[PDB]
């Protein structure tokens, strides 16, 4: 449950890069 | 030499500029300093001696400030 | 032992807060 | 302890280990101590740098105390999330994000007398499909005049650029007229109220749309990493997470003396305490003294 | 809350609306006859209009006791709510143990029987890995650091693209 | 026949189940406020968890929940700010009293929902004849503390508060709302204060009116301060701090009320000093120095250090347009003392930043011999919202507490300062403001 | 055009952060994996160590090629010219030496581990993507 501690700043303002949908649900239906 | 500043100089700002410009000459050479204005400098002066440049502008100081703190945080 | 507190259990644990301090106590004394 | 500038930032904050240090500091000051004089020094580069690295210490534990509204119905959980982020920015020393990013624009482009460079120096702070949309009308106007459009305000080429920039701005979905009517204002306050009640409507819609975009991105990242995790066998999963836990413990206690490492190990001991106090009585949750 | 509030014994709840606990007060001039009765137990005291405004002096300030964080608990709650959605479609899986008998073994093609036993092993792999609920607390620690780095912005924690584009239209369509 | 822990155990068993609706959790919250259950916080946590977990809300149960959260002194920003969805969705379904309780309890918690406050403000200013003035004061308190500076509902409230006769707590809530808004219209406030003649039933109304007339700076009333003289036991220490601060700001010479309030707040401080914020401790140092009523030997030094801490923290988190204003007023102060060239101006403004005797930082500290003159600027957050735009009471307090340290405070308002066209006019204004308080400079 | 002098002789980043990284001829990375962390600058032209700095070359360096390890053996600290015509297997002997150093580096302690550097002078740029593909495939 540990996360690596980071000390960094984001200088830019970006859309948060939504990831595409994984193909697990139709694979399990297959 | 030619001097680039951000603002048109005052006559106390001018005589103090020659107090610091004389230390970039290694003799008793009293210079024939002219003036020039470009406000992309964030204040300060750039002395162009026609063979060497002394960039004591704040706009380069804030860039060397950013380049100094961007390398310590990559090591620290 | 058990039943610590409430103001000690309100602390978010694995936020950073101290690599920020490890930088800023080694940057501001080094950049001044 | 605190260097007396951290304790000045922690007064307005309401996170736990900042309020604990504030209460311990004033408990020390009550029992016969002297408050140190603040440094009236450290010119504005150092002041902005330590302001940044001190507001980070108010943002970073405050972000971890704000619940994400993942998978919720309506807009009011997103409004709660954005309200918590706004109050965290207020407690951290930031102003309104409109004010703050306009200050960022005015700081980064104080010298840019060309519209090309005011578009190519705020490129990190605006969306790329709006920077492209403004470079489109920039190239259209500078092809109309065959002269550079200057960042003056009263050059007529700048107004012939702004007449189409306002068109692409209202085509983007944002009312530029209400934004300009708020940030300039009028004389009578009943018309200032009438433009503020539309600017704040746009502003609320904009920050909740951006908070919902961040929430949808977190939801997609969680769904992707779960569907990458649900395709594995259980033994691979257990040995992967055990190796990651071992690596993150090793990276903590190989470097001792640093305050973050001892805080990390105090936090893993506190997680073990939480697990023990939940295993003592699972119907009562963790044991909280009161 | 703020310092002072202005509520109590004025436009107050006079009755209860559930059956699991029923309530009745007495809307008199100054005081109140409160009658609370939740199921079997019943209590009654008297409170005044100057006693409900003394209630909001010292604030409660409810706060959450989480294992790691409230952020981490929210991400783990979403991982659990997605794992329930995957478990719900591993719940409509067709029963293969009703076709394990030798009257189904010896009637079937050998490769199709191998496929059937591998399909049962595949369901057992999927069902053992969808109910490993102790791995969500280490999965949610991978969504935390990139998100928290996105909130450590130099502008603001709550800055977005739409707010920045609106303020850039304010910055550009004014002079200088 | 009568046992309060019995019904408390029945309630905590009621909200421990998983199929809890909105109506029984509303009734449990109401039953927790009617029985003074401040000492048991986990039951309040259970009822707020099961209140935030409910999906469908009607008007009455949501109004009872929000009334219960407001009255019971409980706040949790997540579950209260998440209740604004049911509030917005039921807004054509609410009655004026229900809408008033909802907007009052959501504004008093600081919920940032501008759609809710706009859609409530429109239906208040459209249909205001059916709204009782306490309900208008409730919606005004909600829009005021919600972060909206809505002057349409403020004017429509002032019309009703001048046309109708209101109660004590209605006028006190309206005064608190106007003090948060910072409007200070004379014809509204003097119409509001004709109702403090019957004597207040609760000291929260008198303390809120005290803080409101202190921050708006009208003057003391001799009727509110009698209520604070008699009913100074009905207040929290954090409440009596705000009361004494708004008394000392508003020119109250009645030092026995300051005695009665400091005898409340000082045993709470010497018992546990961590109970109050340092903003309240700064306000207590203000109320101690302006009224002159003596604090104990450990409390006065503590609040004197805490005022320096609070003023310096308000200097570190400065609005950053106030920073430009302070730099501009310091530059005009350098020009006013004689500086025709820029290094002289820079060397003066780097020298004007001396340290206060408690440990604070003063931006413009001028010294000639033994006399000290401070120049303070008040940009926009410390001015009233109306077209006079005078400085608020907090900087009158700052001037009166720096004058006790020896600094003749010359205040520079920003509706006066940078509306001037050039810098020599600003230097003229700064020098004429210094000579008003100190002709020796 | 104005030419500014930097005041410094040509130097490259050296250190353990250069491991795993594809750099160009000046130390700047070209692998697209961000900037070089955990490195320090040092000059490219250092004077070679003298007589008393030397030691007799005694411990072997195994190339994994049994013709080289049997007949033409290498010691640690040796200069061995791989000379031949084109397309005869000079690069194959060099890459086999690097891959064998990776294979030997797993069964020795920390002290006697060999860290390889491959300098590609004037090669085709698609050839040295095949080599980083082969080195990331083998683990070298
Ligand atoms: N031991 C070996 N066994 C089989 N094939 C080999 C062996 N060594 C080299 N080769 C083959 O010989 C070809 C040339 O090898 P290599 O590139 O190492 O020689 P080279 O002298 O470096 O060539 P060039 O001068 O063109 O760079 C390669 O395609 C390789 O597949
Ligand atoms: Mg070759």
From TrEMBL, chain B:
Domain of life, source organism: Eukaryota
Subcellular location: Membrane
Family, per entry: Belongs to the ATPase delta chain family.
Protein name as catalogued: Mitochondrial ATP synthase subunit OSCP
Native source species: Polytomella sp. Pringsheim 198.80
Automatic annotation (TrEMBL), chain C:
Transmembrane segments: none
Subcellular location, record wording: Mitochondrion inner membrane
Family: Belongs to the ATPase alpha/beta chains family.
Record function comment: Mitochondrial membrane ATP synthase (F(1)F(0) ATP synthase or Complex V) produces ATP from ADP in the presence of a proton gradient across the membrane which is generated by electron transport complexes of the respiratory chain. F-type ATPases consist of two structural domains, F(1) - containing the extramembraneous catalytic core, and F(0) - containing the membrane proton channel, linked together by a central stalk and a peripheral stalk. During catalysis, ATP synthesis in the catalytic domain of F(1) is coupled via a rotary mechanism of the central stalk subunits to proton translocation. Produces ATP from ADP in the presence of a proton gradient across the membrane.
Protein name as catalogued: ATP synthase subunit alpha
Organism name: Polytomella sp. Pringsheim 198.80
Gene giving rise to this polypeptide: atp1
Portion of the parent chain present: 40 to 71 of 562
TrEMBL record, chain D:
Domain of life: Eukaryota
UniProt protein name: Mitochondrial ATP synthase associated protein ASA4
Biological source species: Polytomella sp. Pringsheim 198.80
Lineage start: Eukaryota, Viridiplantae, Chlorophyta, core chlorophytes, Chlorophyceae
Gene: asa4
TrEMBL record, chain E:
Descriptive protein name: Mitochondrial ATP synthase associated protein ASA7
Species of provenance: Polytomella sp. Pringsheim 198.80
Source taxonomy: Eukaryota, Viridiplantae, Chlorophyta, core chlorophytes, Chlorophyceae
């Amino acid at each position: 449950y540990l996360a690596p501690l980071r000390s960094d700043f984001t200088e830019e303002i970006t859309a948060p890069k939504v990831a595409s949908a994984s193909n697990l649900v139709n694979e399990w239906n297959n | 030499c030619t001097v680039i500043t951000a603002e048109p100089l005052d006559k106390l700002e001018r005589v103090e500029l020659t107090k610091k410009a004389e230390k970039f000459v290694d003799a008793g050479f009293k210079l024939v300093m002219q003036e020039k204005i470009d406000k992309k400098l964030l204040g300060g002066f750039v002395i162009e001696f026609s063979d060497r440049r002394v960039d004591m502008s704040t706009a380069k100081k804030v860039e060397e400030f950013n380049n100094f703190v961007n390398k310590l945080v990559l090591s620290i | 032992a058990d039943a610590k507190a409430l103001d000690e259990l309100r602390k978010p644990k694995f936020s950073s807060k101290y690599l920020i301090q490890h930088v800023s106590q080694k940057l501001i004394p080094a950049v001044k | 302890a605190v260097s007396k500038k951290e304790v000045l930032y922690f007064l307005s904050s309401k996170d736990a280990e900042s309020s604990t240090a504030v209460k311990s500091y004033l408990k020390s000051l009550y029992a016969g101590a002297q408050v140190e004089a603040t440094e009236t020094d450290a010119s504005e580069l150092i002041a902005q740098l330590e302001k940044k690295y001190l507001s980070a210490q108010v943002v970073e534990p405050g972000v971890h105390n704000i619940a994400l509204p993942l998978g919720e119905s309506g807009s009011a959980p997103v409004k709660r999330y954005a309200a918590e982020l706004f109050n965290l920015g207020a407690q951290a020393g930031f102003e309104c994000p409109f004010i703050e990013v306009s200050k960022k624009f005015g700081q980064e482009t104080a010298t840019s007398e060309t519209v090309k460079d005011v578009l190519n120096k705020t490129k990190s702070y605006v969306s790329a499909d709006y920077n492209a949309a403004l470079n489109e009308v920039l190239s259209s106007v500078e092809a109309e005049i065959n002269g550079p459009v200057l960042f003056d305000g009263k050059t007529e080429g700048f107004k012939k650029f702004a007449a189409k920039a306002k068109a692409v701005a209202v085509s983007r979905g944002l009312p530029a007229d209400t934004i300009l009517a708020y940030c300039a204002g009028s004389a009578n306050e009943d018309a200032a109220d009438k433009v503020s009640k539309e600017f704040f409507t746009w502003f609320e819609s904009a920050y909740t749309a951006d908070a919902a975009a961040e929430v949808k991105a977190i939801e997609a990242e969680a769904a992707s990493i779960l569907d990458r995790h649900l395709a594995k066998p259980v033994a691979q999963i257990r040995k992967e997470q055990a190796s990651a836990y071992a690596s993150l413990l090793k990276r903590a206690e190989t470097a001792k003396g640093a305050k973050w490492a001892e805080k990390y190990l105090e936090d893993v001991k506190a997680v073990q305490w939480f697990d023990a106090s939940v295993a003592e009585a699972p119907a009562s949750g963790p044991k909280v003294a009161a | 809350l703020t310092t002072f509030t202005f509520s109590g014994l004025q436009d107050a709840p006079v009755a209860a609306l559930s059956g699991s606990i029923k309530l009745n007060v007495a809307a008199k001039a100054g005081k109140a006859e409160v009658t609370v009765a939740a199921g079997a137990a019943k209590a009654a005291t008297q409170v005044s209009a100057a006693a409900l405004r003394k209630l909001s002096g010292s604030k409660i300030s409810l706060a959450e006791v989480a294992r790691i964080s409230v952020l981490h608990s929210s991400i783990q709650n979403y991982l659990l709510s997605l794992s329930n959605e995957r478990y719900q479609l591993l719940s409509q899986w067709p029963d293969f143990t009703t076709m394990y008998g030798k009257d189904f073994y010896y009637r079937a093609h050998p490769e199709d029987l191998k496929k059937f036993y591998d399909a049962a092993d595949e369901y057992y792999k999927l069902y053992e890995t969808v109910t490993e609920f102790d791995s969500l607390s280490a999965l949610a620690s991978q969504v935390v650091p990139n998100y928290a780095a996105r909130r450590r912005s130099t502008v603001h924690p709550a800055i977005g693209s739409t707010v920045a584009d609106g303020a850039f239209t304010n910055f550009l369509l004014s002079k200088q | 026949e009568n046992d309060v822990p019995a019904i408390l155990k029945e309630i905590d068993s009621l909200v421990s189940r998983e199929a809890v609706s909105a109506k029984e959790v509303s009734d449990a919250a109401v039953a927790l406020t009617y029985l003074q259950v401040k000492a048991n916080r986990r039951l309040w946590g259970k009822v707020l968890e099961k209140a935030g977990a409910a999906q469908d809300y009607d008007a009455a149960s949501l109004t009872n929940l929000l009334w219960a959260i407001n009255t019971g002194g409980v706040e949790h920003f997540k579950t209260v700010a998440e209740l604004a969805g049911p509030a917005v969705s039921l807004l054509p379904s609410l009655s004026p009293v229900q809408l008033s309780i909802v907007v009052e309890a959501l504004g008093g918690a600081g919920v940032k929902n501008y759609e809710l406050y706009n859609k409530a403000s429109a239906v208040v200013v459209s249909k205001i004849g059916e709204f009782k003035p306490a309900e208008i004061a409730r919606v005004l308190y909600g829009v005021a503390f919600g972060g909206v500076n809505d002057v349409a509902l403020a004017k429509a409230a002032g019309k009703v508060f001048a046309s109708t006769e209101v109660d004590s707590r209605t006028a006190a809530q309206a005064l608190y709302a106007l003090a948060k808004l910072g409007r200070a219209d004379k014809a509204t406030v003097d119409a509001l204060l004709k109702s403090f003649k019957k004597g207040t039933e609760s000291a929260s109304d008198a303390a809120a009116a005290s803080f409101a007339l202190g921050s708006l700076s009208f003057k003391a009333e001799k009727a509110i301060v009698d209520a604070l003289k008699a009913s100074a036991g009905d207040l929290a220490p954090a409440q009596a701090v705000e009361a004494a601060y708004g008394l000392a700001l508003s020119g109250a010479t009645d030092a026995e009320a300051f005695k009665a309030l400091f005898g409340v707040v000082a045993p709470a401080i010497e018992k546990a000093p961590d109970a109050l914020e340092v903003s309240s401790l700064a306000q207590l140092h203000v109320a101690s120095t302006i009224s002159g009523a003596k604090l104990p030997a450990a409390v006065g030094s503590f609040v004197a250090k805490a005022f320096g801490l609070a003023a310096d923290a308000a200097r570190l988190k400065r609005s950053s347009a106030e920073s430009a204003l302070v730099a501009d007023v310091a530059a005009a102060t350098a020009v006013a003392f004689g500086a025709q060239y820029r290094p002289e101006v820079a060397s003066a403004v780097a020298s004007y930043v001396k340290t206060a005797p408690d440990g604070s930082v003063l931006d413009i500290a001028i010294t000639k011999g033994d006399a000290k003159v401070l120049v303070q600027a008040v940009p926009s957050s410390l001015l009233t919202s109306t077209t006079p735009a005078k400085p608020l009471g907090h900087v009158a307090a700052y001037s009166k507490v720096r004058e006790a340290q020896g600094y003749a405070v010359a205040v520079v308002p920003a509706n006066e300062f940078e509306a001037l066209p050039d810098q020599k006019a600003k230097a003229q204004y700064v020098l004429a403001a210094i000579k008003k308080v100190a002709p020796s400079f | 055009d104005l030419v500014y002098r930097t005041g410094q002789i040509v130097n490259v980043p050296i250190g353990p952060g250069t491991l795993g990284r594809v750099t160009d001829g000046l130390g700047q990375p070209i692998d697209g994996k961000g900037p070089l962390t955990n490195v320090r600058s040092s000059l490219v032209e250092v004077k070679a160590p003298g007589i008393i700095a030397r030691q007799s070359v005694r411990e072997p360096l195994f190339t994994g090629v049994k013709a080289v390890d049997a007949l033409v053996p290498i010691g640690r600290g040796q200069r061995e010219l791989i000379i031949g015509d084109r397309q005869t297997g000079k690069t194959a002997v060099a890459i086999d030496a690097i891959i064998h150093q990776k294979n030997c580096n797993e069964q020795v302690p920390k002290a006697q581990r060999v860290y390889c550097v491959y300098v590609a002078v004037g090669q085709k740029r698609s050839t040295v993507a095949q080599l980083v593909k082969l080195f990331t495939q083998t683990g070298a």
